[PDB]
Amino acid sequence: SELIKENMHMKLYMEGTVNNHHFKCTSEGEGKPYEGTQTMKIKVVEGGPLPFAFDILATSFSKTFINHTQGIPDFFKQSFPEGFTWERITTYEDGGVLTATQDTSLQNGCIIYNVKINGVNFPSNGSVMQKKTLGWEANTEMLYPADGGLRGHSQMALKLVGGGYLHCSFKTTYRSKKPAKNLKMPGFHFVDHRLERIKEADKETYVEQHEMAVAKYCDLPS
Amino acid sequence: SELIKENMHMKLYMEGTVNNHHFKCTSEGEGKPYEGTQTMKIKVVEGGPLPFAFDILATSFSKTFINHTQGIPDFFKQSFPEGFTWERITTYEDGGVLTATQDTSLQNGCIIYNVKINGVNFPSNGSVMQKKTLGWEANTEMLYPADGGLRGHSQMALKLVGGGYLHCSFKTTYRSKKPAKNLKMPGFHFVDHRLERIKEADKETYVEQHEMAVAKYCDLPS
Numbered sequence: 001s002e003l004i005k006e007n008m009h010m011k012l013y014m015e016g017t018v019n020n021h022h023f024k025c026t027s028e029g030e031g032k033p034y035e036g037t038q039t040m041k042i043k044v045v046e047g048g049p050l051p052f053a054f055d056i057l058a059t060s061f062s063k064t065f066i067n068h069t070q071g072i073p074d075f076f077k078q079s080f081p082e083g084f085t086w087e088r089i090t091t092y093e094d095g096g097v098l099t100a101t102q103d104t105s106l107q108n109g110c111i112i113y114n115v116k117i118n119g120v121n122f123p124s125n126g127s128v129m130q131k132k133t134l135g136w137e138a139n140t141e142m143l144y145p146a147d148g149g150l151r152g153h154s155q156m157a158l159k160l161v162g163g164g165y166l167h168c169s170f171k172t173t174y175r176s177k178k179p180a181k182n183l184k185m186p187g188f189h190f191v192d193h194r195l196e197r198i199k200e201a202d203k204e205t206y207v208e209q210h211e212m213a214v215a216k217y218c219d220l221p222s
Numbered sequence: 223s224e225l226i227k228e229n230m231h232m233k234l235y236m237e238g239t240v241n242n243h244h245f246k247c248t249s250e251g252e253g254k255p256y257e258g259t260q261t262m263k264i265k266v267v268e269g270g271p272l273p274f275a276f277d278i279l280a281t282s283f284s285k286t287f288i289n290h291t292q293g294i295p296d297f298f299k300q301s302f303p304e305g306f307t308w309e310r311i312t313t314y315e316d317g318g319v320l321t322a323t324q325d326t327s328l329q330n331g332c333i334i335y336n337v338k339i340n341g342v343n344f345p346s347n348g349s350v351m352q353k354k355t356l357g358w359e360a361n362t363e364m365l366y367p368a369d370g371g372l373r374g375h376s377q378m379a380l381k382l383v384g385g386g387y388l389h390c391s392f393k394t395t396y397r398s399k400k401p402a403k404n405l406k407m408p409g410f411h412f413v414d415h416r417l418e419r420i421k422e423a424d425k426e427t428y429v430e431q432h433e434m435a436v437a438k439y440c441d442l443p444s
Contacts, residue, residue, distance in 0.1 A: 137364070137410055137440070138440035138442060139364075140362050142359070142361075142377065142379055142389075144379065144386075144387050145386075146386070151389075153377055153379075153389055153391075154377075155364065155375050155376075155377055155391070157364055157366065157375075157410065165366050165410065167375055169375075169377070169391060188359055188379065188387065192441065192442060193442075194440055194442045194444070196444065212442050212443070212444065214442065217360075218359070218360035218416055219414065219441070220360065220414060220416045220434055220436070221434070
């Protein structure tokens with residue numbers, strides 16, 4: 001993947017609605033694609049301050065930045081220069097869903113994300129709309145080939161003020177924009193994740209967020 | 223937990239239906255509760271050979287056998303001598319659900335499992351009812367306290383004849399039969415799991431299953 005350097009910058013444009021509250025965000029960031037680390041500085045540029053927990057948007061802001069161990073082929077880095085798309089729905093425990101559709105492209109050596117968000121039915125007095133959340137536990141995504149791409153399935157736990165958790169799960173499909181003749185497809189494997197909040201200002205109008213991600217197989221001793 | 227020795231034997235009785243097909247199984251096994259390893263020899267004793275994949279029963283055959291690292295308290299071993307119960311529903315991608323209710327007790331030094339199975343709506347010509355499955359990938363359960371005990375959430379991928387996977391997820395509640403003022407509760411953590419078969423025969427009317435399980439926190443730096 002010669003176009004993907006040791007360090008890469010990213011820029012993002014996001015627009016959407018959550019319970020019919022419209023907003024837009026942009027972000028800029030940098031990471032080390034082969035080391036699986038990245039950081040983004042995010043701004044809410046319309047519809048701020050958001051009237052819902054920023055945490056529900058966290059996984060919508062970057063699959064190029066996964067460290068691949070154990071010889072696992074890299075569906076995402078192989079897709080350049082054309083890039084790939086992803087599409088996802090996250091279902092929350094207490095009623096809410098957040099759907100997102102994303103395009104990942106490469107322009108002048110900069111990775112570019114374009115995201116559309118459609119979140120519906122979050123309980124009006126529940127944890128998300130009343131901003132009672134405190135960020136995400138770590139998790140492991142499962143990825144395997146499917147319906148024309150890679151299928152991801154994930155579950156995650158959102159920490160709540162007071163010490164409890166709100167569970168969610170999601171299903172993702174990743175689709176390469178490169179002809180498939182030119183891809184070495186990975187088999188079933190895991191991406192071990194962690195999402196870290198770095199800072200926020202102005203009621204989450206500005207948020208800095210970091211991720212580490214490692215692709216691997218089952219880690220249990222033979 | 224000194225009723226739970228370094229080696230423990232288990233005996234199990236299981237009865238239920240899948241798509242209105244009645245069956246019973248029994249099993250005997252042994253494991254090392256603190257090393258997180260165990261083996262069970264399972265027989266179908268009524269309703270065999272089962273007209274559906276044995277794989278959908280695999281998680282219904284033992285939480286006392288988890289290795290606890292990083293100082294994580296052991297909800298299960300702490301529950302003895304009274305023991306604990308679990309209850310679970312697994313939802314499968316192509317339709318079908320497998321509901322199970324279990325009691326775990328300790329009698330004359332042997333751990334005893336009693337399990338009731340209720341599986342419904344599996345597609346009659348689907349992979350499960352047509353016995354076209356080839357066992358489970360590894361996975362990690364998430365566990366945290368809930369009203370009345372510990373809540374687990376899981377997802378698993380079932381290998382299919384001819385390649386590809388059928389996805390499922392499940393939610394479990396574990397309840398101690400011991401007074402709670404007498405328990406040190408764990409916080410949010412993971413159980414890194416893997417199921418394997420040692421041998422099988424005669425259309426899965428005999429299956430010997432092995433598990434290795436380790437409770438841990440996120441294994442990524444930072």
